[PDB]
Amino acid sequence: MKEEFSYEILEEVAVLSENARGWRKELNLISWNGRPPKFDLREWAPDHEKMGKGITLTNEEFAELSKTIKSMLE
Amino acid sequence: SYEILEEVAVLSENARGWRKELNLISWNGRPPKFDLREWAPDHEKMGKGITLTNEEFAELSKTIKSMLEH
């Protein structure tokens, strides 16, 4: 509970923050239910037992986010 | 309630007009935060998205930095 999340999370890419209850805002690469993998930015309970609110990035959005973050860093 | 202080980038585009955008947003007049979210045309309506603190956005930029190489 949930070993389902463990299967869907393909790569844990970044932990952005953690709160006093152990929840973390995370960038992960995720396949929801066998769908094409996507980057996912979202709050997760301590052992990924439950997810909170967040957003998925299609690969086109993630490249645009990435081109932006790069040029916006020199 | 909220104010968009800068529109930093549009990541994606709807057929129905909606865009996924990275913006700087001040909530209730507090210092702005980066915000990744879906917006209807003209920002007429706010959709689903997520706010990032300064520390969260810094870690994200560093991570993305690595994935390039730096």
Side-chain angles (χ1 to χ4, degrees), chain A residues 2-53:
Chain A
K2 306 298 177 59
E3 320 87 18
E4 203 169 336
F5 283 137
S6 75
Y7 183 76
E8 298 175 314
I9 295 174
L10 309 179
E11 192 184 16
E12 310 187 353
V13 182
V15 175
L16 307 189
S17 73
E18 177 177 38
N19 70 20
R21 297 308 303 158
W23 283 61
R24 298 140 109 218
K25 198 169 287 164
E26 288 176 22
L27 180 71
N28 294 314
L29 179 72
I30 298 197
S31 183
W32 302 118
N33 303 73
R35 294 296 289 153
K38 285 179 191 182
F39 290 102
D40 186 78
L41 194 59
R42 168 184 320 275
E43 201 79 21
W44 288 92
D47 203 37
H48 302 279
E49 68 193 334
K50 179 173 176 309
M51 83 174 81
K53 58 173 65 70

Side-chain angles (χ1 to χ4, degrees), chain A residues 13-14 16-17 25 27 41-42 53-57 60-62 64-66 68-70 72, chain B residues 8-9 11-12 20 22 34 36-37 48-52 56-57 59-61 63-64 67-68:
Chain A
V13 182
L16 307 189
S17 73
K25 198 169 287 164
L27 180 71
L41 194 59
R42 168 184 320 275
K53 58 173 65 70
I55 190 169
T56 310
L57 297 172
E60 83 252 353
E61 303 173 327
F62 189 77
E64 283 287 349
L65 177 54
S66 207
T68 294
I69 284 192
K70 163 181 173 172
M72 156 202 183
Chain B
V8 185
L11 318 182
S12 91
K20 196 168 298 189
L22 177 67
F34 288 102
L36 264 163
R37 178 176 318 265
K48 175 192 65 177
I50 197 146
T51 307
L52 295 179
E56 290 167 337
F57 193 87
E59 294 274 15
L60 175 60
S61 309
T63 301
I64 285 169
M67 304 175 205
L68 280 17

